[PDB]
């Protein structure tokens, strides 16, 4: 295996292979953020789909000017 | 444990059928009415934590519809028009009062409301529902506190039913707690 | 808040309280019981 | 057994080593980040705020003649353009390079967090007086960080400066 | 007329230290997770 300056510079970034946090770790936080992302995607989809009409959000070409 | 006769073993007076097994003398105010065995899979510590907080909101909510049809504070009258109790949860969200009663309550629950359940779930010493608030020590006297713990929960178990009733009765007919007692008939049906 | 936004939020609440909460309650209640 | 909140347990790493400790770490920020870095930040924010609060009060009562008279927050805008803003940013940044060197020292454990060793007028005579004052600073920084946020938001709404608003409450 | 021996990092490594000033300062290490 060749050793290089860039290889030694970036070596700690590729050093902790297989290192894991115990148990579930931050899984509830990930699930909560995924739920927020799903709600956001639903909001933007229904805005584009015109099933959700917020005020001052005219989904139309005529809104360009 | 205020008295075994009021709560705990031998005080299961539903035709006993033994006693919901998880339920036992230890939990406060247990007569063993657990038809659906909720205790069976559940963490009665979240279960006990969950009942007292629903009870405390309701006794406070209930004192409220009753002391609201009977009183309105300096002002209120000019704003809020003069409105029945659900309308307030629709006008208030806009006068802004409520939204600044969800800010501070959210601040309350996040900072102290959520760690305390995790500690009770974690095996921390605090009993489900103990926030250690006893500014005047009615609690201090050990004997009376045991009576209060059975008292607190029973009134809360009563209030949650009453406040649920007050809200159910008013939408169908009448206005508020005091007036619904006031007009017995389905004679006038003021709209919500 | 358009009537459309109100329908959206209540749709989120109903999905939570009619689909997610009842089904999830049942799985925890029967999983723990068996 | 947190003293401030009897119910919650003391967060594990808030043990009173740093002064100002009432165990109030409900959301457990202490465990995730190094406490020493956090104390540095408490005081550094506090220090800006404890000063800014003085300024909103002083800027309102008096302004130097060469600058146009403006409300305290308005100025963030004139000064972005007169160019005073850059000067106050350049210097506060210069002081901060030394601050990065100071922090790295705290992480290596060779500096008490928040100590720049500035006591020119030598007010701190004894190790107790230091503990008394050191607590006072931590309390004022906490009060001030709250109050500066207030002075600004109340102006964003009342469009009145803090002393003027106190004089004419002008309730919403 | 002091003259330190300086038995230390070669000149090029020092230029790297000076470059590491601008691409690897210790500002964000302080916020490392534990
Ligand atoms: C018709 C039959 C019958 C009879 C005679 C009783 C009689 C009684 N029940 Mg009831 N109960 C019954 C059916 C009956 N139960 C059924 C079918 C259920 C639902 C499973 C319950 C659920 C129930 C609860 C939850 C409680 C009682 C309690 C009591 C006792 C009241 C003691 C007190 O003042 O408090 C009393 C002996 C109370 C008790 O025993 O407290 C000491 C009490 O808290 N009962
Ligand atoms: C949401 C409020 C709430 C909560 C969390 C509890 C929780 C509890 N109660 Mg309490 N209780 C309540 C309301 C509540 N109760 C009310 C309103 C009454 C008056 C009827 C009582 C009367 C009562 C008695 C008399 C006794 C209990 C007991 C218990 C414990 C065992 C039962 C269990 O595991 O079910 C947990 C509860 C749930 C999982 C809620 C499920 C609700 C379902 C899903 C919908 C119900 C809708 C309804 C039928 C309409 C547990 C700590 C027993 C005890 O002390 O054991 C320690 C006992 O003897 N409760
Ligand atoms: C579940 C509890 C609950 C909830 C959600 C509300 C919610 C509301 N109340 Mg009610 N209220 C409550 C309990 C509650 N109150 C209690 C216990 C009392 C008796 C003191 C009152 C007496 C009361 C009056 C007289 C009025 C309201 C009004 C209102 C509305 C505006 C908020 C306000 O100014 O409150 C003011 C309420 C208080 C300052 C009392 C709160 C203090 C209690 C003791 C809680 C403290 C907890 C800790 C000890 C809002 C819809 C107003 C309204 O819109 O009427 C049309 C109004 O005029 N409330
Ligand atoms: C039926 C009402 C009732 C009863 C008997 C109790 C009883 C008790 N509570 Mg609970 N509590 C209640 C309602 C009640 N509480 C309500 C409505 C709330 C929400 C505000 C709370 C919130 C609460 C917390 C957060 C804590 C308690 C605690 C306690 C215990 C010690 C405090 C004490 O002795 O106060 C006795 C209380 C009374 C005799 C009520 C008097 C009614 C007053 C005078 C009028 C209303 C207030 C008025 C504006 C002033 C005791 C078992 C503590 C505990 O568990 O310690 C072990 C605790 O940490 N309670
Ligand atoms: C102690 C409680 C109590 C009392 C005194 C009454 C009294 C009355 N009810 Mg009843 N009612 C009660 C509880 C009670 N109810 C409960 C708990 C429920 C829910 C199940 C009902 C459900 C109910 C219905 C569905 C109706 C009544 C009606 C009536 C009135 C019939 C005569 C009339 O119209 O006015 C005569 C005097 C003027 C009468 C005043 C009837 C009514 O008002 O007609 C529209 C009617 O249709 N009630
Ligand atoms: C940004 C400012 C800041 C920072 C970095 C700290 C940092 C610290 N504080 Mg201090 N503190 C502050 C502001 C701050 N505090 C203010 C304003 C108050 C007055 C309420 C206090 C009161 C206080 C006490 C009483 C104690 C501490 C303690 C501590 C230490 C451990 C707790 C911790 O990790 O907090 C981390 C804090 C943050 C990450 C900032 C919060 C950021 C959140 C996520 C955003 C929302 C915050 C929002 C303003 C609060 C909700 C308000 C709501 C209306 C939205 C740590 C050195 C403890 C100590 O001395 O231990 C050494 C201790 O006992 N603090
Ligand atoms: C601590 C007791 C107290 C409570 C719990 C309370 C709650 C609320 C709520 C519910 C959240 C609203 C919405 C509300 C609004 C107004 N209050 Mg306030 N208020 C309280 C105390 C006083 C006093 C002493 C006065 C007063 C006033 C007004 C005016 C008048 C301006 C107008 O003319 O429009 C308005 C709109 C004055 C008044 O008219 O009272 C005769 C005045 O002297 N209030 N108030
Ligand atoms: C579990 C929830 C609940 C509770 C805890 C509860 C307690 C009490 C108490 C306290 C002990 C009294 C004194 C009382 C009195 C009356 N209740 Mg009542 N009540 C509850 C629920 C309902 C529903 C769903 C209805 C209803 C009615 C009436 C009428 C009829 C007058 C009329 O016919 O006009 C009267 C006099 C009906 C009504 O509101 O008509 C639209 C109706 O359908 N209630 N209610
Ligand atoms: C502790 C704890 C927690 C917490 C917490 C909290 C409550 C944290 C709150 C922290 C706060 C509020 C920090 C605020 C800092 C304010 C600053 C730095 C203001 C600087 C202003 C400047 C520089 C200015 C200015 C100005 C001047 C002077 C005049 C003008 O002409 C111009 C200008 C506008 C430029 C919680 C519960 C979350 C969890 C946890 O478990 C433990
Ligand atoms: C603010 C807001 C609103 C709102 C709202 C609110 C506050 C709604 C709250 C409603 C509540 C609290 C309903 C609960 C009623 C009580 C019930 C069903 C239990 C009865 C007891 C039974 C059946 C048996 C008991 C018993 C047991 C267990 C068995 C044996 C015997 C016995 C003792 C009888 C809206 C939604 C209207 C919309 C508006 O835009 C804004
Ligand atoms: C963007 C902008 C700028 C700006 C700006 C600035 C400086 C913005 C900064 C705003 C600040 C600092 C807001 C502070 C919020 C603090 C809160 C809510 C904490 C309160 C304390 C609590 C809740 C205590 C709770 C507690 C109490 C005692 C009891 C319970 C326990 C405990 C939790 C301890 C300009 C002005 C420069 C102009 C430019 O054109 C644009």
């Amino acid at each position: 295996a060749l050793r290089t300056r860039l290889g030694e510079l970036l070596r700690p970034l590729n050093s902790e292979y297989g290192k894991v946090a115990p148990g579930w770790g931050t899984t509830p936080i990930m699930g909560f953020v995924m739920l927020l992302f799903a709600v956001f995607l639903l909001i933007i989809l229904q805005i584009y789909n015109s099933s959700l009409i917020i005020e001052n959000v005219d989904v139309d070409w005529a809104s360009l000017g | 444990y205020r008295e075994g006769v009021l709560q705990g073993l031998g005080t299961d007076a539903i035709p006993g059928t033994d006693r919901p097994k998880n339920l036992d003398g230890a939990l406060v105010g247990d007569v063993g009415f657990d038809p659906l065995g909720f205790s069976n899979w559940l963490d009665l510590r979240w279960a006990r934590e969950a009942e007292i907080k629903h009870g405390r909101v309701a006794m406070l909510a209930a004192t409220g519809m009753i002391v609201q049809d009977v009183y309105k504070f300096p002002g209120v009258q000019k704003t809020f028009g003069d409105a029945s109790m659900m309308k307030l949860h629709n006008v208030a969200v806009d006068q802004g009062a409520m939204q600044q009663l969800f800010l501070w309550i959210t601040v309350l629950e996040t900072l102290t409301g959520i760690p305390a359940i995790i500690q009770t779930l974690n095996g921390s010493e605090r009993q489900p529902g103990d926030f250690g608030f006893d500014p005047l020590g009615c609690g201090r006297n050990p004997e009376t506190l045991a009576r209060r713990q059975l008292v607190e929960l029973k009134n809360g178990r009563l209030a949650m039913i009453a406040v649920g009733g007050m809200v159910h009765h008013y939408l169908l007919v009448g206005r508020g707690p005091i007036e619904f007692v006031k007009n017995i008939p389905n004679f006038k049906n003021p709209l919500p | 808040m358009t009537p459309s936004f109100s329908a959206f939020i209540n749709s989120l609440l109903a999905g939570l309280f009619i689909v997610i909460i009842p089904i999830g309650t049942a799985l925890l209640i029967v999983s723990q019981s068996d | 057994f947190s003293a401030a909140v009897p119910f919650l347990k003391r967060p594990t790493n808030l043990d009173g080593q740093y002064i100002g400790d009432v165990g109030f770490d409900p959301l457990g920020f202490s465990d995730v980040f190094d406490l020493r870095v956090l104390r540095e930040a408490e005081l550094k924010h506090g220090r800006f705020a404890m000063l800014a609060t003085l300024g909103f009060i002083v800027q309102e009562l008096y302004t130097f003649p060469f600058f146009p008279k403006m409300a305290p927050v308005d100025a963030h805008d004139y000064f972005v353009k007169q160019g005073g803003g850059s000067q106050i940013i350049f210097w506060i940044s210069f002081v901060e390079l030394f601050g990065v060197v100071a922090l790295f020292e705290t992480l290596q454990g060779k500096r008490e967090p928040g100590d720049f060793a500035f006591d020119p007028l030598g007010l701190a005579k004894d190790e107790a007086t230091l503990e008394r004052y050191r607590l006072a600073e931590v309390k004022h920084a906490r009060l001030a960080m709250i109050a500066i946020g207030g002075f600004i938001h109340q102006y964003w709404v009342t469009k009145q400066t803090v002393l003027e608003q106190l004089g004419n409450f002008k309730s919403l | 007329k002091a003259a330190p021996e300086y038995n230390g990092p070669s000149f090029r490594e020092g230029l790297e230290y000076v470059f590491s000033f601008v691409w690897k300062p210790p500002i964000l290490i302080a916020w490392k997770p534990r």
Side-chain angles (χ1 to χ4, degrees):
Chain A
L2 178 63
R3 184 182 295 276
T4 54
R5 319 223 48 259
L6 190 61
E8 259 312 298
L9 176 64
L10 302 177
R11 188 66 187 272
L13 300 173
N14 198 74
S15 57
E16 44 194 45
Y17 174 80
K19 218 256 144 220
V20 299
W24 286 104
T26 54
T27 36
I29 304 180
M30 181 198 67
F32 184 75
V33 178
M34 285 193 301
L35 204 61
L36 290 181
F37 189 53
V39 173
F40 165 77
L41 290 180
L42 285 175
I43 290 178
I44 62 177
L45 174 61
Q46 293 190 20
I47 286 178
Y48 204 148
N49 191 260
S50 298
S51 299
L52 175 57
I53 300 97
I54 319 291
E55 284 308 307
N56 322 127
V57 188
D58 182 57
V59 184
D60 187 10
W61 285 104
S63 61
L64 271 72
Chain B
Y1 181 90
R2 185 182 63 61
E3 300 183 60
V5 58
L6 294 179
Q7 65 181 63
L9 300 179
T11 299
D12 58 300
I14 311 179
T17 302
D18 301 300
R19 185 176 185 119
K21 62 179 182 301
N22 301 239
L23 303 183
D24 58 300
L27 298 181
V28 175
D30 175 60
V31 173
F33 180 90
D34 179 60
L36 268 63
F38 275 137
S39 61
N40 296 177
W41 91 87
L42 191 49
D43 209 303
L44 299 184
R45 304 178 300 179
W46 171 275
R48 177 50 54 95
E49 174 85 35
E51 193 164 55
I52 316 181
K53 292 193 186 79
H54 276 86
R56 290 153 177 176
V57 176
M59 311 181 295
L60 297 184
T63 305
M65 295 137 164
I66 302 175
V67 180
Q68 279 176 177
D69 283 0
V70 165
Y71 177 97
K72 288 188 170 185
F73 254 144
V76 187
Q77 291 292 122
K78 305 188 61 177
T79 312
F80 288 153
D82 186 298
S84 302
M85 317 174 306
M86 293 182 181
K87 265 57 186 302
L88 261 26
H89 174 273
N90 308 122
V91 179
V93 287
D94 288 354
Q95 166 259 301
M98 299 283 296
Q99 321 168 3
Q100 287 236 315
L101 290 177
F102 185 91
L103 177 60
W104 301 92
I105 302 183
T106 297
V107 174
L108 183 60
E109 300 297 299
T110 299
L111 299 180
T112 176
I114 192 179
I117 184 58
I118 303 181
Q119 299 181 0
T120 299
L121 298 180
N122 291 359
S124 179
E125 301 67 0
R126 168 185 173 299
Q127 294 61 60
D130 173 59
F131 296 91
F133 174 89
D134 190 2
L136 298 299
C138 300
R140 177 180 177 299
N141 182 0
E143 300 301 300
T144 60
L145 189 175
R147 177 184 180 180
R148 296 296 184 300
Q149 298 181 241
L150 177 60
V151 166
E152 177 181 59
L153 182 55
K154 292 186 176 180
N155 303 246
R157 294 178 176 179
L158 175 61
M160 303 178 185
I161 305 180
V163 59
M166 300 178 180
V167 156
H168 287 91
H169 301 152
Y170 161 89
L171 291 177
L172 297 180
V173 158
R175 171 181 297 359
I178 303 299
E179 299 189 1
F180 185 88
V181 175
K182 182 60 179 59
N183 57 241
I184 306 300
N186 183 62
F187 84 94
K188 281 175 55 60
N189 304 301
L191 183 64
Chain C
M1 199 120 142
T2 44
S4 236
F5 192 73
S6 304
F8 174 68
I9 301 297
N10 312 332
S11 81
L12 286 178
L13 253 2
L16 186 63
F17 276 94
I18 310 179
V19 189
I20 298 180
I21 284 181
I23 293 178
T25 301
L27 174 59
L28 173 86
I29 262 55
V30 188
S31 69
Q32 301 281 338
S33 296
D34 281 323
Chain D
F1 303 90
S2 176
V5 295
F7 51 89
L8 302 181
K9 65 300 179 180
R10 64 63 178 300
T12 177
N13 49 350
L14 296 63
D15 59 60
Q17 179 179 301
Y18 294 151
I19 196 175
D21 180 60
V22 297
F24 175 90
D25 180 60
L27 297 58
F29 300 90
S30 60
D31 302 0
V32 47
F33 300 94
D34 182 0
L35 183 60
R36 300 180 299 180
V37 168
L38 299 176
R39 176 57 57 119
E40 181 61 300
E42 179 175 59
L43 299 180
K44 182 179 301 180
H45 293 83
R47 298 176 180 179
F48 298 95
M50 298 181 300
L51 299 179
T53 161
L54 180 59
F56 292 30
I57 305 299
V58 175
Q59 296 183 176
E60 180 180 0
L61 300 180
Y62 181 32
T63 297
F64 297 151
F66 55 92
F67 293 149
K69 299 183 60 180
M70 299 178 300
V73 304
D74 301 0
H76 179 266
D77 300 300
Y78 176 89
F79 294 93
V80 299
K81 300 179 300 180
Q82 179 177 55
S86 61
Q87 295 294 298
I88 306 180
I89 293 297
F90 178 90
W91 298 91
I92 63 182
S93 301
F94 177 90
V95 175
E96 293 295 60
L97 299 62
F98 303 94
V100 175
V101 181
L103 183 59
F104 185 30
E105 299 297 0
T106 289
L107 300 179
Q108 300 181 1
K110 298 181 300 180
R111 175 181 172 241
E112 298 297 0
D115 178 60
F116 296 93
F118 178 89
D119 181 1
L121 300 180
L123 301 180
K125 57 181 300 180
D126 299 60
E127 299 298 0
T129 299
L130 181 63
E131 300 301 300
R132 179 180 59 180
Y133 297 158
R134 181 177 180 240
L135 179 61
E137 180 179 60
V138 185
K139 299 183 179 181
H140 299 38
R142 297 177 176 179
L143 180 59
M145 290 176 291
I146 303 180
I148 184 60
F151 302 159
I152 305 182
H153 302 97
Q154 302 180 181
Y155 180 90
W156 287 329
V157 173
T158 61
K159 293 59 180 180
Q160 300 180 301
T161 61
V162 50
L163 300 180
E164 180 180 60
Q165 181 179 0
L166 299 180
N168 179 241
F169 186 87
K170 182 60 59 59
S171 60
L172 296 60
Chain E
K1 298 181 180 180
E5 178 179 60
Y6 182 76
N7 52 301
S10 63
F11 187 88
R12 184 202 65 179
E13 300 176 60
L15 302 181
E16 301 179 0
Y17 171 76
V18 176
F19 197 47
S20 71
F21 272 178
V22 313
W23 64 267
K24 202 229 306 176
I27 309 180
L28 295 178
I29 66 177
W31 301 115
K32 99 258 114 283
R34 287 106 41 93

